[PDB]
Design a protein around this ligand. Structure first.
Ligand SMILES: Nc1ccc(CNC(=O)[C@@H]2CCCN2C(=O)[C@H](N)Cc2ccccc2)cn1
Ligand SMILES: [Ca+2]
Length: 223
């Protein structure tokens, strides 16, 4: 997260860190057994880390649970990043508490102009590299479809939306991949892609979760 703020420990209790020997992506806990992340975060050997603030120190509220199965969306296209969504099943159910909590799925899509919360442990620099240990947060509005398509001609599908600031300075970044965009108490986006971070006229692009609720519900009903 570039240009954001320190969230405060466990104040984003649905935020998870995906670990394969190191943090490599975020995700969102949607019930005690399932995490939503980005398809581009797929790899084998994932451990889901819940209850995290400082990802380099065991502070006492963590739950570390290995994934039993990952399911990349059947239509994910890694060339266009269309359908950039993946479900991860936990080997055992998380213990839900005030610091480890699920985020509701949307029933309707969010509106342009709505302010959302984006969070993660990704790079905090727009030029260069600095990775934080504690969870960072950003308030960012959903941008109009027109401005999103103008920023990325030929590349925005109906399964994507832009959020952030066309003037730059504030954005998600590498390492935030797969993490949540929460608007009005619902998981409306997944950190997906962009062009650099916090650059002028290149806002973050996010998977439009409301288009995937039927697939999520069906998949968790049979796995
Ligand atoms: N504002 C941001 C930007 C990035 C991220 C994290 N996500 C990534 O870094 C993903 C993972 C795979 C590569 N990637 C990218 O985004 C490529 N730049 C896409 C691209 C490729 C080619 C042309 C234009 C664009 C979050 N917030
Ligand atoms: Ca920790």
């Amino acid at each position: 997260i570039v240009g954001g703020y320190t969230c405060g420990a466990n104040t984003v209790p649905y935020q998870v860190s995906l670990n394969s020997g190191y943090h490599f992506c975020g995700g969102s806990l949607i019930n005690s057994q399932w995490v939503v992340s980005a398809a581009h975060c797929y790899k084998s050997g994932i451990q889901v880390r819940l209850g995290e603030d400082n990802i380099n120190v065991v502070e006492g509220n963590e739950q570390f649970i290995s994934a039993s199965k990952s399911i990349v969306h059947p239509s994910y296209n890694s060339n266009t990043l269309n359908n950039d969504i993946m479900l991860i099943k936990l080997k055992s159910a998380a213990s839900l508490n005030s610091r480890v909590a699920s985020i509701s799925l949307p029933t309707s899509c969010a509106s342009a102009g709505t302010q959302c919360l984006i969070s993660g442990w990704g790079n905090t620099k727009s030029s260069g590299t600095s990775y934080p240990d504690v969870l960072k947060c950003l308030k960012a509005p959903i941008l109009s479809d027109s401005s999103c398509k103008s920023a990325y001609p030929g590349q925005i599908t109906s399964n994507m939306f832009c959020a952030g600031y066309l003037e730059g300075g504030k954005d998600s970044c590498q390492g935030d991949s797969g993490g949540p965009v929460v608007c009005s108490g619902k998981l409306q986006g997944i950190v997906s892609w962009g062009s650099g971070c916090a650059q002028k006229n290149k806002p973050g692009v996010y998977t439009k979760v409301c288009n995937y609720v039927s697939w999520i519900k069906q998949t968790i009903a049979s796995n």
